[PDB]
Amino acid sequence: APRKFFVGGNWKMNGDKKSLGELIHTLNGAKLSADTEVVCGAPSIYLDFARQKLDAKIGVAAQNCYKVPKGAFTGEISPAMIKDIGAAWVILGHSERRHVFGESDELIGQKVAHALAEGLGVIACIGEKLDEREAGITEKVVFEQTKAIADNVKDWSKVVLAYEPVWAIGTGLWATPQQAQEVHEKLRGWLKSHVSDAVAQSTRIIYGGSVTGGNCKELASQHDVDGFLVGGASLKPEFVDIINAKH
Amino acid sequence: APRKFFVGGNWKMNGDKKSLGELIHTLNGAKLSADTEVVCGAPSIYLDFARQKLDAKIGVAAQNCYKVPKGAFTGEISPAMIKDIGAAWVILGHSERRHVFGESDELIGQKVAHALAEGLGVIACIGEKLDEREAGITEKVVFEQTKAIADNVKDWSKVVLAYEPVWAIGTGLWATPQQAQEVHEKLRGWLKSHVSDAVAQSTRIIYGGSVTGGNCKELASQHDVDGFLVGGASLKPEFVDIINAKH
């Protein structure tokens, strides 16, 4: 009935076999809450390794994919390949893909539709830049990005939405609990009016942007924040504390 | 003195464990000419698998990488990771990177410098579009693309240039042997004038764009064509024939 708390780790472009191996050993050995759904997003080269080594109870996500199953796209991977190695999730629309690599809402929407058709879960990311926030246009931006995704989702049961203020990613500035709650409750109301009440009540909306062991309890306690997408701290032992933020 | 014949296979976004497993078994079982240097470019998610399964005389290439060893670049992999799993090459500046994904000359140049600094070999791609060839400007386009790469190269010993006309990639159209020789010869004279004689004489310049079992011998016979980068036919048993083009 209540939405299951969800914590994702995004390792970004970090790790080697030795260091990722150590991190995974730690996670497997920790006491993690029975009521948190945990997913680790590994570099593509280490997806197979990560799935082999991680406790099955912990999910594995790719950090990107492309929009068709196969073909002449040098350097890309498809949902079919991700499923083949046993990963169950993909992260789409991350700030770094949008703003460093130039991925448009239209591309991201096609990626979302293809991932879902192939049976993967999607962590779909949205968020505003500082200049947008300061111009009063957070709601407009966040709703535009969300519509582009929603228009391409036919089954909401394997979607998680991640709200990541761009100014909060990797900077140490985090949104206040009140800043996060405002956006998350507005996103939920958007889902209610534009999709359905059932989808609004069931869909996890998670916060990302400088989540650490020090701030996770306060953020987690907000009524419409259902978890986190964690970058820098997901490579450290305090990731365990974040997974257990509700306890 | 002369240059070792070089054949790279670019698998692009194709395969699964089962299917690539059967392809690797074929290559390992085949009689491949000892005087051909062979490299297979696998999808990033299968790079570790491919290097584990392929006989040691066959080199493994990543299909792309980014320009720093680590950091906040969701979806990317670095040379340090490629090296970690035991691959020795990377393909950079592929037409699909430049034209589907919008990678610039300056970015490709910074990727080349970084992969070389980290001990990888680089297969560096250049090529003109149909409209450029028809306008009669092939030479201008290849010489600018080449200058971008070369300004970032201090040791040419681990660099292979791949001339691939964009209009020939995946379509079945191939440059005539005379068209390919013409460009290769001009590229070599540019390396002579702007780098050195010895680099000109030692650097392999390979041709790609719809190389098959049927045209490889006619292509390989040209003086300044030192090998091939093969896409489509690299997933097929005739790949063995292409490796053996000189015999």
Swiss-Prot record, chains A, B:
What GO molecular function annotations does the UniProt record carry, in alphabetical order? methylglyoxal synthase activity; protein homodimerization activity; triose-phosphate isomerase activity; ubiquitin protein ligase binding
- GO cellular component terms? cytosol
Any idea which UniProt keywords this protein has? Cytoplasm, Gluconeogenesis, Glycolysis, Isomerase, Lyase
Q: According to the UniProt entry, what is the EC number of this protein?
A: 5.3.1.1, 4.2.3.3
GO BP terms: namely: canonical glycolysis; gluconeogenesis; glyceraldehyde-3-phosphate biosynthetic process; glycerol catabolic process; glycolytic process; methylglyoxal biosynthetic process
Q: In which pathway does it act?
A: Carbohydrate degradation; glycolysis; D-glyceraldehyde 3-phosphate from glycerone phosphate: step 1/1; Carbohydrate biosynthesis; gluconeogenesis
Where is substrate annotated to bind?
A: N10, K12
Quote the catalytic activity from the record: dihydroxyacetone phosphate = methylglyoxal + phosphate; D-glyceraldehyde 3-phosphate = dihydroxyacetone phosphate
Which Pfam family name is an example for this entry? TIM
The residues responsible for catalysis, as annotated, are: H94, E164
- InterPro entries xref list: Aldolase_TIM, TIM_sf, TrioseP_Isoase_bac/euk, Triosephosphate_isomerase, Triosephosphate_isomerase_AS
Q: Which domain of life is it from?
A: Eukaryota
Q: Where in the cell is it found?
A: Cytoplasm
Q: What is its main location?
A: cytoplasm
Q: What does this protein do?
A: Triosephosphate isomerase is an extremely efficient metabolic enzyme that catalyzes the interconversion between dihydroxyacetone phosphate (DHAP) and D-glyceraldehyde-3-phosphate (G3P) in glycolysis and gluconeogenesis.
So what family is this one in? Answer: Belongs to the triosephosphate isomerase family.
Q: Assembly state and interactors?
A: Homodimer.
Please identify the protein, giving its name as recorded: Triosephosphate isomerase
Q: Which organism is it from?
A: Gallus gallus (Chicken)
